[PDB]
């Protein structure tokens, strides 16, 4: 009810003591949680979404709770607290939580060492949902140390952590991209080359997008060289996704940069690769159009 109510109406008239007992019953509900439900999550998200700026004085309380939960023994509650962070992430800042949003930044940089995929994925989600509000160049762990830490995670062979990791690296390569070195981007290219075999298609589309972003940050030529050598692989669904990626690189950085190399590669006498070239031109003419 309360969630439906304040979500439709707004929280203008909710006075002091009322809002207090509300925030507190909220904390209780969320700890007391004993089911895997978005019920209490969405309740929390909405309630602080409407408290807007009313929530300043309880951020020690709210976080301290969430952090003690983040310390727990059983995975489930840990994961829950990571979720709840990913909800309230925006208001965490918007109340100017220097100590506190700084907290969540560095402390999650700590938990990046987990080995329960179910918690590691949620941690990556919460870090992404912090970086969305606070941009790159005032992140509490500078992405100059974040992304180097992230690259050895791309090898985690699990759908949820892989989804969220490639999401975070795609954000960074899109916008950050210059607090990192060319060599870092090259290693990360070589790791992306084998996300193209995940069993989930969201991962593979995210991978192709980030190949695009890396072609924008670094020049196209080295990434294109690393894509042709992948075309030489067999098994079709990672050949086809590298051929999408070639199309994407060519679309962003103009097609004259890549067309000669594609055409020239049409001469290596192998089948899978001549067909890779032809399929890539297919996608390319679709993407560029007029």
């Amino acid at each position: 009810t309360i969630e439906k109510i304040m979500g439709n109406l707004g929280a203008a008239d909710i006075d002091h003591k009322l809002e207090e007992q509300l925030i507190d019953g909220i904390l209780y509900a969320f700890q007391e949680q004993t089911t895997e439900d978005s019920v209490m999550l969405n309740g929390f998200g909405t309630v602080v979404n409407a408290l807007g700026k009313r929530v300043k004085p309880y951020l020690p309380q709210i976080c301290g709770t969430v952090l003690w939960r983040l310390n727990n023994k059983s995975a489930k509650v840990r994961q829950q607290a990571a979720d709840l962070i990913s909800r309230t992430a925006v208001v965490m800042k918007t109340c100017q939580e220097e100590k506190l949003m700084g907290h969540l930044g560095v402390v999650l940089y700590e938990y990046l060492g987990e080995e329960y995929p179910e918690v590691l994925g949620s941690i990556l989600g919460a870090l992404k949902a912090i970086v969305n509000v606070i941009g790159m160049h005032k992140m509490t762990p500078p992405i100059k140390d974040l992304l180097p830490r992230l690259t050895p995670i791309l090898k985690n062979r699990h759908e949820k952590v892989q989804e969220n990791c490639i999401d975070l690296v795609g954000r960074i390569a899109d916008r950050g991209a210059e607090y990192v070195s060319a060599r870092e981007w090259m290693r990360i290219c070589f790791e992306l080359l084998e996300l193209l075999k995940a069993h989930k298609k969201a991962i593979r589309r995210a991978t192709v997008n980030t190949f695009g972003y890396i072609a924008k940050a670094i020049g196209p030529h080295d990434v294109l060289a690393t894509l042709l050598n992948n075309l030489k692989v067999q098994e079709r669904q990672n050949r086809v996704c590298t051929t999408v990626a070639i199309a994407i690189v060519a679309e962003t950085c103009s097609p004259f940069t890549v067309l000669p190399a594609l055409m020239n590669e049409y001469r290596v006498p192998e089948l899978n690769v001549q067909n890779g070239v032809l399929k890539s031109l297919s996608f390319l003419f679709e993407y560029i159009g007029e």
Binding site: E194, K232, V233, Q234, E235, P269, E270, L271, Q274
Partner: protein
């Protein structure tokens, strides 16, 4: 005791590609040692 300065271990896809290539050289060797004029490798491999 391993050594420092090394990459990883080749992944099954690369191991497969090079198993293939080695097999092909095995074939070229045998058709060499058996001197076949009835052979071709076509422009598609």
């Amino acid at each position: 005791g391993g050594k420092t300065g090394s990459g990883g271990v080749a992944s099954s896809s690369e191991s497969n590609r090079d198993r293939r290539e080695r097999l092909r050289q095995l074939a070229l060797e045998t058709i060499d040692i058996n001197k076949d004029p009835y052979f071709m490798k076509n422009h598609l491999g």
